A paper describes a structure:
Nsp5 is a 33 kDa cysteine protease, also known as main protease (Mpro), or 3C-like protease (3CLpro). Mpro of SARS-CoV-2 produces 12 functional proteins that mediate viral replication and transcription and are highly conserved among several common coronaviruses. The active pocket of Mpro is located between domains I and II and is characterized as a non-canonical duplex of cysteine 145 and histidine 41 (Cys145 and His41) with four binding sites, S1′, S1, S2, and S4. The SARS-CoV-2 Mpro D48N mutant possesses a single amino acid substitution in the residue located near the Mpro active site and has been identified in Alpha, Beta, Gamma, Delta, and Omicron variants as well as recently emerged Omicron XBB subvariants, as documented in the Global Initiative on Sharing All Influenza Data (GISAID).
The complex crystal structure of Mpro-D48N-PF-07321332 was resolved at 2.07 Å resolution. Unlike shikonin, PF-07321332 can be found in both protomers of Mpro-D48N. PF-07321332 occupies subsites S1, S2, and S4 of SARS-CoV-2 Mpro D48N. The electron density map shows that the nitrile carbon of PF-07321332 forms a C-S covalent bond with the S atom of Cys145, which is the Mpro-D48N catalytic residue. The lactam ring of PF-07321332 can be successfully inserted into the S1 subsite of Mpro D48N. The oxygen of the lactam ring forms a hydrogen bond with residue Leu167. Additionally, the oxygen and nitrogen atoms in the trifluoroacetamide of PF-07321332 also have hydrogen bonding interactions with Glu166. In summary, PF-07321332 occupies the active site of Mpro D48N through covalent binding to Cys145 and hydrogen bonding interaction with several conserved residues. The Mpro D48N mutant loses the hydrogen bond with the two water molecules that formed to stabilize PF-07321332 in wild-type Mpro-PF-07321332 structure. The results showed that PF-07321332 had a potent inhibitory effect against SARS-CoV-2 Mpro D48N with an IC50 of 9.531 μM.
Numbering used by the authors:
A (entry chain B): 3 to 300
B (entry chain A): 4 to 298
Amino acid sequence: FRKMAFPSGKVEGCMVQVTCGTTTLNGLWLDDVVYCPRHVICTSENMLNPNYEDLLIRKSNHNFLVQAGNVQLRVIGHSMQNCVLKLKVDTANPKTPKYKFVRIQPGQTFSVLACYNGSPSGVYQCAMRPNFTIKGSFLNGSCGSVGFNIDYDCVSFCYMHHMELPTGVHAGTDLEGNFYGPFVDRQTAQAAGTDTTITVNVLAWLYAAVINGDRWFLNRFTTTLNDFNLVAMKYNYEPLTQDHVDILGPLSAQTGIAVLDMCASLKELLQNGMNGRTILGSALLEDEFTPFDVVRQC
Amino acid sequence: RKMAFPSGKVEGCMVQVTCGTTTLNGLWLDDVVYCPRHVICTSENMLNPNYEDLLIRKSNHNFLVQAGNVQLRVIGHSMQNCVLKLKVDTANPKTPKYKFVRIQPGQTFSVLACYNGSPSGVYQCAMRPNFTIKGSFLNGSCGSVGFNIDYDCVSFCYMHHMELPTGVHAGTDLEGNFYGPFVDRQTAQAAGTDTTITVNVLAWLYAAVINGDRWFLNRFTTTLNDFNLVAMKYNYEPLTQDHVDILGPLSAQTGIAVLDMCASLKELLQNGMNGRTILGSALLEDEFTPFDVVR
Ligand SMILES: CC(C)(C)[C@H](NC(=O)C(F)(F)F)C(=O)N1C[C@H]2[C@@H]([C@H]1C(=O)N[C@H](C=N)C[C@@H]1CCNC1=O)C2(C)C
Ligand SMILES: CC(C)(C)[C@H](NC(=O)C(F)(F)F)C(=O)N1C[C@H]2[C@@H]([C@H]1C(=O)N[C@H](C=N)C[C@@H]1CCNC1=O)C2(C)C
């Protein structure tokens, strides 16, 4: 059971390089618009507390250099939507996929296409943490890289990368420029809140363990949502809702293990540990697989 | 994070190959489709297939090749070790710059898992020392390929053929020669005992020092032989002088001598992590190569 990213070719064909003055990052080129983080119009001097409304009025089309591989794109218009810059360009991308912009919830997963200088570098699978950060791998120049899901040739863009927090986790917006989490696009002191484990994803991962070989952690017992939720808080675990139980229903129906019975397994694992046994070859409990992820893979 | 390569250059080469009732994936490069030769097997042939006798009875029109909605015309065919090479009517217009390479255990690569010719997911892999892949491959995944990409040239190194009973996977290079002692035949065969890729753990430890963690270092050193005598008690691969030379650059960039990093690994194996993590893991990661670390 591997963590898998979506195939990235539909997105690779949209990545471009955006340069404003001395600042270069990545942009997303869909039809005749290029989307990128608005802090590209910041001068490094003004990363501390910029006024984006003012800095953009003073910009003109000629302040933006957009490069698609070998080819320079001519910017013919610019505007802002929340924290993303929208650069209208000369040419529609002939590789534009069927796509939509969506906003995801903490605990959902997506693929990230990490890019540098407009050129795709690698792909990995991520989860939006309960504290609204991403445990990604982003280096200098990675801003504007996007995250996405694919459903039957339709790309759902859900994330654009903006910044790294002092604990090495990452923060970004949806493609309409709304931040995930209580962060702002400026170099001021900010930090991730204390993170928590995504309970519904651990359970889904335990179902995947049962779907494969592993069954030793099953027991005769069952809990209640209220009794399990007291256990969850003690171990820094997101509380489990009736909504989570309902979505795990398919896996509970397929494997014959009710969710509150799996919770009994999980509560038991959280207290007594694994006693030298493993689950899908892992010694810790994995929480970056959603229920849909497990159904899809299996 | 362990990252796969962007998969688009390979997605444009995946096709569907059908022969009778068997369908799997093929790789379409220029005017040749490559795929596993057991596409020409039926039910009653998996146990003891005679591939020469099965192939002699086929003609070009027995092979149905589909690239998306378009049927390709097969105009020739031949067998090279355990891969079939289907000469087609049309050169793939999306053929990337590519080459074929055979890799060694410990090497990493990306896998594009496909079903019925359409890409489903991409993940990053290592060739294990027992010549198997710890992959994620379902019923129709055969013919999925593994690859690296360097300066826009795609190095194809793996094509998927079989699942072993332990859940791991075996396959061939793109010339059809199996990695390890496996055969494309449904008989009792089993992966040998697997071991940890020691040179990859050490390279990763060097990556931890470079990103500013040093908690696992100690003041000891070790001889190469003493290191290997301890490490093999944990099912770690022996470290060779070639591996030592290979880590040299990282040892220079960090100032930590290779054998001093070996002493730290012996201690990590002795103690565990005591609830800590090194890069982002509570496990010793062995699927990032020395070459990977510098990049
Ligand atoms: C880490 C740093 C101290 C530099 C800063 N962090 C914080 O200001 C915080 F602590 F508030 F998060 C930060 O990321 N930025 C400062 C400045 C932009 C952003 C930035 O340079 N983004 C990079 C875009 N290519 C990607 C970064 C590069 C390192 N790894 C990444 O992912 C803006 C928030 C406007
Ligand atoms: C797992 C099974 C017991 C069926 C068998 N294994 C062994 O015979 C062994 F144990 F000896 F390896 C096995 O894999 N095959 C039997 C037959 C082909 C191959 C096969 O069906 N390949 C699939 C290609 N689409 C991919 C497989 C599907 C399951 N998961 C995969 O990855 C050949 C070896 C000629």
